[PDB]
Every structure is written in structure tokens, then in C-alpha cells.
Structure 1
Amino acid sequence: AKARPQHIFYRRFLGKDGRRDPKCQWKFAVIFWGNDPYGLKKLSQAFQFGGVKAGPVSCLPHPGPPITYCVYVYCQNKDTSKKVQMARLAWEASHPLAGNLQSSIVKFKKPLPLTQ
């Protein structure tokens, strides 16, 4: 529903990257974090392609003595991950509505079983 235009933006932005190469192992990702969770929720729903899959929204730990929500985006190759980092950054500049998420590229040693 609400995350739909954002989805199409990434759809043509990522281009070839969205399609999945069965050989590549899921070893990199992009973590987005902000204070407004529903924004991340729409980001999570938007980044759903064969080649780029976002996990659900969750938190980072903070010592109690404001919650920080985050969403992890998993991508087949390091090249793609940077692209996702740009993709959102473009949307943020493109659409003034969208809040400004901080982010960081993620590097896994051992691959993950996203598929097969």
C-alpha cells in the first residue's frame, strides 16, 4: 500500500541489481537507522526484490540511564550494497517528505541463507 511508490523508485533505480544471480552468496547488507519506525517499515517493505531483501524493523541497544529502530537490507554483492545506500539517499533528496535515515554498509564473513 503506502510503501508502493518508494518501491517503484528503487525498482528502476537498481535496474539490473534487483534481479538475483543464483551464484552470489548473501554476504553484504545496508543498515538504516532512525527514530521514526514507520518510516523504516515502509523502507523495509520497499526493498523487496530478488536481489535485494530487507529484513523486518528492529532496534539497537541503548543504555536506559529515545529508541533507535533499524532495518537491515541484504544484498548479493558489495557493489549492490552501495547502490542501495545511494538508492535511499536519492529518494531522500528526491522526495522532501521522507525523513533522513542514517545508514552504513555491512560486511559479513560467512554467507547467509537468504535463498537455496
Structure 2
Amino acid sequence: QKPHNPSDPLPKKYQGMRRHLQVTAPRLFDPEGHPPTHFKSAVMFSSTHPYTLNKLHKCIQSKHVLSTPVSCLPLVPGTTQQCVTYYLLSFVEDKKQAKKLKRVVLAYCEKYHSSVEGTIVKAKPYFPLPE
């Protein structure tokens, strides 16, 4: 896979969520300023739906929040009673931003993408994002 290119315009379908995120969390989606020096935190967004996280991958992108493309979690051996769970990581500066991003994204998703779950994640000393 290859990472998202910010310059690419959003499809119309995704514009609703993006606009909502810009209004609700304007500091995390402010097109101005410099990205944070370190991304010590992230929210893992997960869903059993294979395509719902595509929307999140495209919408949850700015200078202050960087999202991986959609991948999938590993299977728990050797259960057959399970399904594939898909996920992405939305990297942010600190836990404070992560809690905020989770809350805001889930609030939107609880109504329209209810299978989406969020998990606050933390790295030490921070995440190895290419510089």
C-alpha cells in the first residue's frame, strides 16, 4: 500500500464528514500552521465492514492528524468463530488530541457508521513517522 496524498480532492461522499470534522475539531484540521514535531499518540479506528474505514482514511487527514490506509487485524488462532476486523491508525500529537479525535469521530460514526470502534494508542517515545 501507499499513503494518502493530501493534495488529492475528496470525493463528494466524503466531504460531509470532513466538513463536520473541520467545524467540530478546527485545531486538528486547521489547514494552516506546521504539523506537530512528534506524534506520540494515535486512535486506532476499527470495523468489521471492509469499506467504511475508507471514508475515515480520506476524511481524517490534515497537518495535525495523519491516517494510515486501511489494513486488517490478525486472526486469533485457532478460532473459526470470528471474522476479519479492518483498522487504520490516525496519528496525533498527544493523548489529549487522541481523546478528542476519538470522541469527535465516534460521535459522527455512532449515528452513521455504528460498527466503527476507536482505540486510543500511545507510542514511546513517539511513532516512527517518516521525516
The more displaced of 29-38 and 15-24 is 15-24
1:18 is aligned to: 29
Give 1:109 shift.
0.2
More strand by percentage:
1
Determine whether 1:82 maps to 2:130. Answer: no
Give the count of matched residue pairs. 114
Whole-angstrom CA distance in 2 between matches of 1:115 and 1:80: 20
- Partner of 2:3 in structure 1? none
Per the alignment, do residues 77 and 21 of structure 1 end up closer, same or farther by CA in structure 2, a change over 3 Å counting?
A: farther
4+ residue runs of structure 1 moved beyond 2 angstroms? 17-24, 96-100, 110-116
Letter in 2 for 1:98: H
Per the TM alignment, residue 23 of structure 1 is displaced from its structure 2 partner at its CA by 5.2
Identical-pair percentage: 30
Q: What SS is found at the alignment partner of 2:70? A: strand
User: Which of the two has higher C-alpha Rg?
Assistant: 2
Q: 1:9-48 to 2 correspondence within 5 Å?
A: 9-19=20-30, 21-22=34-35, 24-48=37-61
Shift of 1:15: 1.3
TM-score (norm 2): 0.76
Instruction: Judge conservation of contact 2:35–2:63 (CA < 8 Å) in 1.
Output: no
Q: Give the structure-1-normalised TM-score.
A: 0.85
Q: What stretches of structure 1 of length at least 5 have no aligned partner?
A: none
Matched residue type, 2:89: Y
Indicate the residue corresponding to 1:71 in structure 2: 88
* Residue ranges of structure 2 left out of the alignment (5+ in a row): 1-10
Given residue 9 of structure 1, which amino acid in structure 2 is its aligned partner? Answer: H
What is the match of residue 115 of structure 2?
A: 100
